[PDB]
Write an enzyme that holds these catalytic residues in place. Structure first.
Site, mmCIF file in Angstrom:
data_model
loop_
_atom_site.group_PDB
_atom_site.id
_atom_site.type_symbol
_atom_site.label_atom_id
_atom_site.label_comp_id
_atom_site.label_asym_id
_atom_site.label_seq_id
_atom_site.Cartn_x
_atom_site.Cartn_y
_atom_site.Cartn_z
ATOM 1 N N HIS A 134 0.815 -1.283 -0.150
ATOM 2 C CA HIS A 134 -0.024 -0.190 0.060
ATOM 3 C C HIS A 134 0.714 1.296 0.154
ATOM 4 O O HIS A 134 0.330 2.486 -0.306
ATOM 5 C CB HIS A 134 -1.039 -0.011 1.183
ATOM 6 C CG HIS A 134 -0.546 0.385 2.422
ATOM 7 N ND1 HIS A 134 -0.395 -0.529 3.522
ATOM 8 C CD2 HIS A 134 -0.406 1.657 3.059
ATOM 9 C CE1 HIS A 134 0.210 0.238 4.456
ATOM 10 N NE2 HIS A 134 0.267 1.805 4.292
ATOM 11 N N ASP B 120 -0.068 -7.530 2.047
ATOM 12 C CA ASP B 120 0.017 -6.223 1.883
ATOM 13 C C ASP B 120 1.780 -6.016 2.014
ATOM 14 O O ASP B 120 2.485 -5.995 3.018
ATOM 15 C CB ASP B 120 -0.402 -5.253 2.857
ATOM 16 C CG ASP B 120 0.197 -3.952 2.707
ATOM 17 O OD1 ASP B 120 0.445 -3.497 1.788
ATOM 18 O OD2 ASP B 120 -0.242 -3.140 3.817
ATOM 19 N N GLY C 108 2.672 6.833 8.164
ATOM 20 C CA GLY C 108 3.990 6.925 8.136
ATOM 21 C C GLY C 108 4.944 5.842 8.686
ATOM 22 O O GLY C 108 6.411 5.939 8.338
ATOM 23 N N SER D 244 3.915 2.691 8.174
ATOM 24 C CA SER D 244 3.615 1.721 7.299
ATOM 25 C C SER D 244 4.833 1.386 6.652
ATOM 26 O O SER D 244 5.721 1.936 5.994
ATOM 27 C CB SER D 244 2.607 2.264 6.098
ATOM 28 O OG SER D 244 1.407 2.488 6.733
ATOM 29 N N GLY D 245 4.887 -0.025 6.408
ATOM 30 C CA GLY D 245 6.160 -0.881 5.673
ATOM 31 C C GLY D 245 7.173 -1.117 6.642
ATOM 32 O O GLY D 245 7.988 -1.816 6.247
#
Ligand SMILES: [Ca+2]
Length: 223
Positions: A40, A84, A175, A177-178
């Site tokens: 995402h 994801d 922020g 994320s990942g």
């Protein structure tokens, strides 16, 4: 990260910032040429920044390397956030040292109750917004599948785990994320989704990395 603490400088040497004008998502270095992140967070041009602590100041440990290939999981679903996960190949290999290092992929999935470390430069407030320059850290446990599925009825697949606290106050946010969830030296989670950040009874949900070791290995060997 809401409810965290400022990590010691360069104490999380596998954390990367993904940059496209500014920081937008996190990632983890898993070998000298490859970073793993959330699908995402996809964008068409990304610069990977390694060895960061303060993202607003150049400090002298940093390596900034452009992504050469960006590969999202072929079964990523934008509605449910299943799968994801995304891999990024660097245009040249990172040079590994004390400030820049790989994290191991998981040898097995993790027990409920396992303590983990979550890190990132995402939002730090649970009312409003404030993005930090210094990397933030948070320790949190893997929740049982019971506590996770009750929080999000019908929404948790086999490729997701919940990590965090049902009382609220401590969670990852926009922020982050990942970025990485590391438990006993192994990358077990990628920051993925949630309802808001740090709300009571709504813990963060993370991509369950132990299901993807085959896909990661096969994608690296082929590219
Ligand atoms: Ca810096």
């Amino acid at each position: 990260i809401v409810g965290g603490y400022t990590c010691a400088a360069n104490s999380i040497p596998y954390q990367v910032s993904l940059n496209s004008g500014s920081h937008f998502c996190g990632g983890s270095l898993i070998n000298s040429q490859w970073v793993v992140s959330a699908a995402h967070c996809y964008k068409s041009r990304i610069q990977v920044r390694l060895g960061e602590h303060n993202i607003d100041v150049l400090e002298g440990n940093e390596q900034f390397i452009n992504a050469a290939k960006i590969i999202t999981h072929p079964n990523f679903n934008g509605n449910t956030l299943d799968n994801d996960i995304m891999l990024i190949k660097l245009s040249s290999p990172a040079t590994l040292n004390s400030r820049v290092a790989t994290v191991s992929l998981p040898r097995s999935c993790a027990a409920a109750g396992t303590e983990c470390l979550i890190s990132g430069w995402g939002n730090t407030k649970s009312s409003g917004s404030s993005y930090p320059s210094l990397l933030q850290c948070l320790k949190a446990p893997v929740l049982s599948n019971s506590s996770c599925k009750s929080s999000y009825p019908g929404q948790i697949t086999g490729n997701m785990i919940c990590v965090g606290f049902l009382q609220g106050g401590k969670d990852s946010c926009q922020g982050d994320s990942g970025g990485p969830v590391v438990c006993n030296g192994q990358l077990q989670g990628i920051v993925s989704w949630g309802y808001g950040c740090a709300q009571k009874n709504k813990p963060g949900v993370y991509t369950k990395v132990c299901n993807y070791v085959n896909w990661i290995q096969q994608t690296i060997a082929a590219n």
